[model samples]
Target: SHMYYSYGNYEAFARPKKPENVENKSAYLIGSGLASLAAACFLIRDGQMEGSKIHILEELPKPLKGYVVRGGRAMENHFECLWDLFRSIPSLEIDNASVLDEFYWLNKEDPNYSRCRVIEKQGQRLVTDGDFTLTKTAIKEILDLCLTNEEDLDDVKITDVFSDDFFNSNFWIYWKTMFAFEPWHSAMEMRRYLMRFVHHISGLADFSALKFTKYNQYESLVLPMVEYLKSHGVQFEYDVKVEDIKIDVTTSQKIAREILIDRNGNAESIKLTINDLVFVTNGSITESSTYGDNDTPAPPTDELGGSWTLWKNLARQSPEFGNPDKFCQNIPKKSWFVSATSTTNNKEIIDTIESICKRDPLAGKTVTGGIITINDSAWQMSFTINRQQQFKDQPENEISTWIYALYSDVNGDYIKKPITECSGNEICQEWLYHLGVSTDKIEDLAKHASNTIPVYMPYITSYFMTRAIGDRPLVVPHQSQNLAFIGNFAETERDTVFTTEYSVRTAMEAVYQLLNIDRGIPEVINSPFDLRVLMDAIYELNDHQDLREITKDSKMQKLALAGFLKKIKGTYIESLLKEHKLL
Candidate 1:
């Protein structure tokens, strides 16, 4: 007999009894990112810690929130920790539904499927047709890399295993742009992504597997989560920069004892008791981000003023804290420029995008074309148009479009100067040029009709840097009693960084492990082990052709294929493959 269990039925399962002094103990979460927020929530909900005893320290003036439009974060279907946390928090829109419920409802009502994926040959929309025509050697290399141990590929770049032909293929363009990967990025990270998102390979051509929020991420996700935490009495101490953490260490054990903070330009220290817990968010992707308007260029800044400094300080004291220098040392290749275009009472840009995409970008409340990548641009520019009123308080006449360039130091094809040296107006002009906008009206339209704001993030892709095993400290380092690390920089097996899901998963694991909560942290999905998923992936990689069709006319190949077919002829494997359109 099968038993049905309802979600949020916390009482149905046996939970560990809360420690008697749990209410008296206090928790200080350093840095106010999603990891810190989720850790606070888990401490309250599962650890039975009182919200009043928890403190989240943020360096920024505003409450800790994720980026508003930092190249839109699309939550995949298997984001377990993200969904688990949101399932308990009530939505801002619907009365009865949780945030997860509302998210599902919104996406279901208006699903995401990009009509135009790539732009080639100046402005022509490349026909995707669900074909990721990877060469045979490229396919074999990818499979070999996936099967290889991560330790063997340590400090190896993605280009180390593949040929130049693979890098110039349509597969590379789609994959690299989709994930913001470069040729020099960590091979281990690339392999992790391949295995982690193996199931989505078929849907990647048109972005059918992607999902978006109802509004901007700040409004739709962070604000609601902040409000929920506040309603439960969580204290958000903003403008409080954590300078360093003092840890008392012996040969046997380590304990976080004091926290140094810069409050209002003055140094302040908070002494911690043995019962106090510290969760450190070691690094930040959006740190040192500076913005510029149409007339001004966004100057390059290397001020490691926030989480990087704090992490460096802690690392200096103990080797166990991790090596922050490994990720932060390189900036030129790691950083990129992102721009947001705010259109004021103008539909010409929208009409132009519609004509190029062959679909209305804002059809009703959904954006049909997800990301329009200019594949032939020197700067490697890509832009996306979100649904109308991306921000809840945005005016109906105003529309937002986000653009980013991977090669910030390189000169643009249309604009004379490098992307980093260009003003917001110049950036918009280059974008308009790629969109086939008439040159005569480019300057006028950019200045009057559209206002562009460019932002330069120096360490956006630092987490994906080539590194060894001990480069990232464990979530809960060995012999640690009252401290844990939670964020992108913390080490978690099988989970990739540069994602919201990674942050939440780190939080969930840290909380559950530290508090000894009798709950199972969600396991990373192992879709690679599933025969059906693998077969479907193989089919898609082969451009929807059957394995037998793609094989050469050699006697050995024919004999192997015949034997494999005969082995599965009378079995359900044949039916399974056929069901996935893989046969």
Candidate 2:
């Protein structure tokens, strides 16, 4: 009798190899986001490809065209690969740490308001110092110091840390509002941030040297990569969606068939020649869409063009591609909203706000007057301080600020009634109200705003949860001929995803693994919170009793509660406090 073990044999099925025909091969890439860009760079830089052999087939007109199309806020030092990728790019000097000095955190209890100098009366002044010297030092010490706890910070209210009345006024509401830490995200995430960016935090107060690049990311990051590939003679095809592959079961090999969709909406079938490899860019879960006013409901079907259809169809065709439904079923994690305003006047009313914020971003500390938020019954809106840098398609005096809202729980009723019923103005009002602003009107804010501030409603973390998806493989399983997956939706373990790096890394992994390129790949850098953070997270989890029990009717809540519990225990909380040196 064969000996059986509960864990099963550690040595499983043999890994498949790249198809023989494409050994010295030509390649084709689907989806033109970070994944595609990474793959293209890897092939030319490492695989020694002639300029003309590779092809990048994208569905959209522009590549890397995910969210941030209308100016999205980006956090510093979150994802590992993104930092490395930015460092490796020679031509792109896009580091902007200037305005970061304007950053300050307000403790919920006692807050100190400070810029380069401490101005708050009778408050523990935490000044930025010259060129952000003092602030950066504080950030660095917290991130690198590995503090257990201090006798001082223990007494401060999380909100008052930024208030002028607090001990360190810089630690008050000003910083909290800027970063979106409403005590909802993970504290470990905050902790990890403090440690990871120990070196840069101290200098963040200096904004003079920080830089901004010309053009939006689509043009700045994505198009340049595409053009680089094309310069090397890489081919790019558009509007062709790959359906499924014809597998040859007996020979243990696969052949992929592509479905070509023309502008007139005609479909045609095309098969690849010998040894051709397929690298897919995954789906469109992050694409944008417009939501109508309160009177009309957002279109439920195909309202947001998700690429899940292709994945669904592929799953039906082959088991080798794995299950897409298991990942796509949760819709609440995917819903999000965005509003963008572009204008020519640099000194617009928005500019006045920017000026006040420029001098001291934490302008109004009056409890009810600072920043108002509209807590809609359905979705609560979160805002970012307006950054009208020259790069955001604005002239010197013109002001453009974008505000966004994301609802992790879609089932909850919206306060504005139905999300579909809220007009663009009403949505703005909800946002302002939540921010603690006094006005019931934002007519000037909505002026010349086109597309009605599109809302991208999804079913999962397609909008924000850019962390590494664990179950996904680095390459497509079963070694299917001419087929692979790349994008945020694809798998890259241990590394925090949800940024440009994940997509690019996926591209690199797929191109090398599928084409048998012998180039060296980077190891996944574990975050500082690997073991101890996980332990702390577990402790937090044990504190939440209801999450431990599972019931059929309570499965959704149970699972969500459990997952969030694990996150807090593991990473989320660390990401939060660490950002503000609270940990």
Candidate 3:
């Protein structure tokens, strides 16, 4: 099992020779989510595995998609393997180009940034002005968390390491709302995020660090890849529910002998041999999710879904299979949130949205460049409008905004009910109140202006639960032959979880290991190791002040900075500082 990380165009552009005995091998994958689909792509593209031999057991019946919004995928530039995978999946919208090309062109031409990020006091803008607004104690605590080793943070909560100072800052509001993290979440994941996105600090303000697709993710990302796979003769087995695989516990290299599944409510098993490879996506982030309409509550869900249920059955068989309960439990407490997709052509609502974001939603360009967090909302609500008409086939007169609330259990300011209990109309009313809509007219607007669909995903952020190593089984577990786990729940050393990149990276890693691919997997961005990035982050966190102005009222600190500047003067080091504006 190789956990490989590499950089440079030499490895990135290299095409590996076809693996021996690949034709005799067949892949059995469970689930049709991002990870499973990505692994199948890797098996064919990189491993030279014949697409016809790859089998996917989907959890849904055919035509599971709908016109209504289910979710969104917030994208960025540094997702290396994600870009690599899409670079091969030909675009559905353009000729002679890849999805990557389409995405690059769209973002490049009309970039993305927010004129207003956070609003409070009934639509009053929170004057962050690109400043983190971190107090000395908060800054020090953050540094303490970031600099600490990950091994030491196992099963540790974010609140265990930091104080109110850190959690009360605008930086917290920014970070917490962006990633949907809680103080009770994993400190280890938080550190990895800090390490992962330290380079993005400069762009955090105004959200130059983010990007979005032309439409919702299903159309923009998933559909293109699905179409691409079908074109290559990849097989998808819909309505087949995977139960578990029989692992050979006595074997020195644990091997899977067979797979158990319930297809169309009938029990069955697929025999496996040494030539059969298994890549199972064990847990799902959006399981047990339910939606509410104009006048109903999306009740809390506590039951384990099939994927996690399947995982529990596997974990009991072997310690190497990972501890699934650590992440799957305490859904609402650890990983719960509410998201609403409101579709509307209401003139007044659209006009009000334009007033807040300062861009006409119908302009079809970047509006609410990223999420606009309502800093004072009891529900911690945040919302965004991506490129207008967020669906490729969306109604011409309608625009959809993706709204999420981090604290769904808390009472809302306007609706006066917990977000999880609020109906679609009530959710819209609460959102409108924060948007500074006229109080008397808010009810009318929410009731008749637009149709909102509120989805309560209890386990949406489940992966962020504080956990130790092996809680998420490795992509290819130790001494495991022909069996792999691929998903956000599957552990990999390369990137942080909860991103499209993590899923694809793990899938790619799984395929390369099972097939013994020769090329190096692209390493996570080297920003954490790059001195220039560190300096830039420092400058940005310090409100873009020079090193001289960054002295925290200490004479010795000022003297030391002056001495360092004098030492680097007329040298390449000075030029380096000048290049990054550290001077």
Candidate 4:
């Protein structure tokens, strides 16, 4: 395998020389998603494939330019694979700049740091202890979870591992709502999140480690990739639903023999050659998504969606193809989340939002820099307003805000109905109520002042479901000659799912391995292995407590700690500790 995980600049900046037989190869991507698009980009940029040879099978006819974003993508500074991919693509709106350059300059000019993160007690800014208010037992439980073996956590519920003390902590409050985790989700994923994101623990109280695009993802991220891909002659076939692929599983090699697709209601089949590479997006978070406008509620749908069905058809072929039903077929404990996008020109509503975020909405800077979580709501709601006029060429007077609730089945704080059952206006009222709007004003604001739309995503959080090994197929399943899975559902070694970084990482790995691109895949950032980061995390998590105070209770331990600190006093280790505020 040519795929190798690497760090630092020698591999990071080195362009892989084109392979011997890339000219004869072509790519067929099953779904038009972030991962799917990323694969096509890597193929062009690194695989040295002809643009015309790339194909995307998309069920949606065309991209919707109008705004109805399910969620704003929360990107970070150190998504190595993501920056590696976007650094090559040109910005759609800027001159002489890559997408990375555009975003870099934008954020440098208008940085993001929120004033309010959570509000409780009828919109009073929830006073926090300036720390993760976790007990010693709770902290011990977290460390235990992180250090536990991967296999030990398999199919284990988070509740099965952590205590009620941990659950009642502020850390849990921030963690669960931020990642959309319910109480009984997979402990394995929770552990992965911790290991993958422990360095970010300090920023979780506020979103100091996160970044956002200038506009909605479809505009700022996806649209640029779409334009770039097409400009290279990549073929995008819309209204094509790939139903299944017939794989010939044998003792030695696994080959994608044929592909079955429903194109515009007509059945069709694709015959594959060894050189015709196939990249399948096994599952989607946004699958079976239904949306509703101001007056109506988004109706529930029972469909397994295209990717789910295709996964089943493939899984039936081989165990290495993965157990699709493990993530999808569970309704015993239903998994879901709902979001509402509210667009309005109401002055009072805009002023109210301005008062809470403490920023001018039209300033074109970060407002509600990240999610403003409602701390004491029945629905566990969180909302954000990016720079005003979220859409392109939107009027300055109008504003757009995105709201999501993890507890969609619970009755809302004000609407008196589950978020799943409420209309957009009702959901808006619930949000307004959380924002401290009076009951009478909330109804008028939702009904007459704003146009809110709700989206119900049935399988949005299904990927977080419990799983054992081999449940989600690896990026390239063992010895698969001409196929790879590229999406959140496809397993990469060290990244967490439900992230843009995860999507691009899988896509990059899939393309590199399949095409035999002899270059280093950017390894996941290694904060977990760095001692300084751990020390910093300890200091931050414990509310910046000094080592003297930390060891005050233990006489012998305090002596040992002081001796260690004294020994390191004149060394670089002391500087490291002091710089990270660990001293």
Candidate 5:
């Protein structure tokens, strides 16, 4: 995570108190989001800074109110930095396990689907044991056991390292789909996540206690931090976008001097006269857009936000400002869909779905879990089931459930028959059918459903496809004096993005590094699988004739666990060990 934007001279300014050297030491934050909120909190509370020292510039009237009106919110599993910022606010304490315990796989063989099982090293199943063992063993056992009995050899190679052919094999598809791995993703990042939450893998069903807070972000995470900064006196402006930046050259490094912007429907400029620090929270992955307003779609580059552009402008002004492009590439095609449905009386819907699946061979034979994804679908590759608590006054049994989906490469084909045709419901129907939920008629479920689902298509992550390398710096780069990049678009080494933790951690890193403050950020957890675990997984999957062979790094292994235990195993203990040559 290289924090230094451009050598030692250029600094990126995000939501910061204006340097005290200014006529009135007040900071200004350009956007209102997780990053902006993060900056406000760090500057006001931990920086021992004042509110007047902080200010925010937002084009939208309120926080969480994006260009588009949708309900797909943000949060990740046990993100250390996000929790830290959330904990600082005393008035907003909300517990939510959906972000954590959103899934519980039913044992495939159980007629009543009463239990949730997870495989671990030595059959040890504790939420605290860091069970990379489950996945590790699952992968290894699948490979070792299945490969030995495999009759075909020409198409499947017994190579020790991963290959394109290996990934394309039948075995790989099963495993990759389960873990949401793609052939294009960094294998190292995937492996890291497999190891990071090893201990907590077994107890996913007990996730009702993961602490979470939601006050529409703008109110909860953003405004409170902003208000605190204001009480301390922070400076802020709205409708101002930093378009470009000037730099001082002639030295090995460079410094920023001026920023250009389009404000209030007019072009404006602000000059930077001091030698003080500037922190920038770069890029927007979860941007909000409305159909109307002067908010014509932001330029693709602007989608990353002006913070990144500021760095780009400076880097172009002088190499000493550092190659900002090294931090991010604004290539499109990285967008994905996140749909949230708020339904009331989900009991009828659940029962109806159960009744339908009870007759199907694949989905009906076993208890359909919280999430059953349908691969090769244009609308969504990933989905989640969530119970809504917004209407807490309602009876517990009548509670609602929220479901989310990640639609990839869906250029309106799934959601629309034509550009102007609205096919959201049609797309949902296709998704359900693709997931093996029998029943050609969607009207039946719609009639009994509680609420409508909001579909969110964020332009964030549009640049993930541009770069071919993994050297992208952390959201807050390392060795940066003043500039910081937050959001999924910013880089985080050996960590997964498209997750709330990445954004929060990026903010935390930026705060600590810029202020030179010392505070603990949750370290990425790492764990490996034991061979004994792999053997157990292998033994379990031996009965499934369909998964009796290994062709890729972790596929056959995970499937083996699903077959043998006759249940879904959440961890990747078996596959990782074999992939790394440990097994």
Candidate 6:
């Protein structure tokens, strides 16, 4: 008999016949990130496993609460797996609205459209009318790179393919800041992002395609997910660290026999039965992160702490576990700094920003404009003012703005010292200087801001680091019976890392594969395969200018254009082509 589990306005369908021994079986999730939370949800919702049988172990004192160090995670229209998961979850804010419903309705009612995507040369707002101005050669190279196999592009950096002209263009400026890509990052990852988000090329300049949650991700996503899992009977063990997993490996099978844990300095082991499953969050981007206040800069630490050790220990056991060193060993290359300013009744900063963007940051309780990237900053700085009341308990008079620097080691344009060496107050001063805040008022403005916390992440972008095959373990590794890996370090086909969707997708895949659930995991949305999407993307890549305007004077160009028109002479395809300005 089918069973329906109702929670508020959402109803979840349980499997007709629960898996054998599911009630007695237990699931142990290594980390309490979104991946583990999602696994617990799937275990209860789809696998029909008893919720009380699930246990999530977290290293922190509390589960899923943290600083907004990673900055805002913007959602988009094509996040298939993300939307799928949230569609079943109810919103905490709005009555009778699912999380997805609230997101859609909020964005629809007050959509994000940035008028000031970039600033240059001391608060000069760049005119972003979707003009990319890509050279013909750059366009060809980008197209070729996207079409090339990821295996062939592995270990290659983004700078290895493109010319300097591409880097100097407006395209690179907008694209890099929006996605936090660097020239030294993996070409395969770059290609993946390009193909996965080809449809968003048009809106990248204005951030019109991006969607924001009602609050910060920690509250809007993690807290609700935690609550949902808790209501279903999932147990959370805080201040518990999983040090290692003892895996029994054969030529054709692998099984996790024991999990080594450190609970508040005491060592313990959880012996696993054949029925018990382990979902390991192999590595974390936020591992080894430390914070500093307004008086001091967050000191750079070289050590690979927390989840890295667990992953390292797992990798030593078997080759199938994948290479963690490729990402973990190079902290200097992957590390960056993020700072968040908490303002109490501080209108000067807000006023300065709103005057530049020409839009009310709190018109509907959020910054309608997404990120404001300072193009001329020596540190390559960018900041975003997220929706007000980011935290559930945040005071009505307080607002927070997050800033991050890609080149933290570089000296600021205004401040002489490197961004990494700057105090929170100094960081604010530099930002205000760029915003044209008068020198006389800088100190008072910073003091009124109340608190600014700078965070140092040694391996923030390690997932995007250059790597070859087998660098990241597959979600359901070959011959793995009751063990799977989730989170950014685990490999999944087609999905980009540094996204909430990637973690959720990994959870979905791992659960479905391990449980033998009769359900299909949603495929990554393939916008590149759509003909109209390609046409629109190509048009946007050429700075919203028609292809006819940029095509060089050659017989091949004419013949190619003629042949294209000949193929769709009398069809609506011709109309579509013209509509997207390909003609």
Write one digit per residue (lDDT tens) for candidate 4, span 1-583: 6599999999989999897699999899999989999999999999989999999999989622125765576888888999999999899989878899988888888877778888886677778823578876787898898889988877899999999899988888878877888877889999989989888877888778778888888888898999899999999999999999988888999899888989999999999998989999998878898888888888877689988999999999988888888887764323555788888888888888888889987788888887888989898888888876778878888888888887766787788888888888998899889888877788998998888888888788887888888898989998898999988888878689889899899999999998888889989999999997898777876667777776688799699999999899989999888888767
Q: What overall lDDT goes with each candidate model?
A: 0.80, 0.43, 0.84, 0.85, 0.43, 0.79
TM-score comparison, 3 vs 5, better candidate: 3
Off by over 4 Å in 5: 1-26, 63-78, 93-182, 201-236, 287-315, 318-370, 375-382, 390-422, 431-441, 444-481, 518-522, 526-583
Choose 2 or 3, whichever is better by TM-score.
3
Q: Can you write out model 6's per-residue Cα lDDT over 1-583, one digit (the tens) per residue?
A: 0111122212223233465667667899998888998888888887899888899999989611223434467988777667768877878888888888988988888788887778876788876535776788888889989889888976898989999778878888888887788778889988889999988887888888889988878778887788788888889999998989999988878999999999988999999986899999998877887777777777777677879999999999888798999887765643464555534457877788778878665554557367788888888888887777677677676667778778876778778888778877778878888888888887777755646777877787788889887899999888888999998889988889988889888888888777777645666776888899999988788776676676656678867977877888889988888887887
Error of 3 at 501 (Å): 0.4
Best lDDT among the predictions, by candidate number? 4
Better of 5 and 6 by lDDT: 6
Stretches of candidate 6 exceeding 4 Å from the true structure: 1-17, 63-71, 333-335, 342-344, 448-450, 566-568, 571-573
Ranked candidates, highest TM-score first: 3, 4, 1, 6, 5, 2
CA shift of 532, model 4, Å: 1.2
What's the lDDT for residue 369 in model 6?
A: 63
Model 4 root-mean-square deviation: 1.9
Q: Write the residue-wise lDDT of candidate 1 on 338-380 in tens digits.
A: 5555444567877877788676655546554477789889888
TM-score of candidate 5 on Cα atoms, chains taken together? 0.59
Clashing pairs in 3: none
Q: Worst lDDT window (10 residues) for model 2?
A: 1-10
What is the TM-score of candidate 1? 0.94
Model 5: per-residue lDDT, tens digit, 172-267? 433343343444443334444444444433333322212223213344445455554555666667777777655455434434466567888799
Each candidate structure's TM-score, on Cα atoms with residue i matched to residue i, is: 0.94, 0.59, 0.97, 0.96, 0.59, 0.93
Report how far residue 358 has shifted in candidate 5, in Å: 13
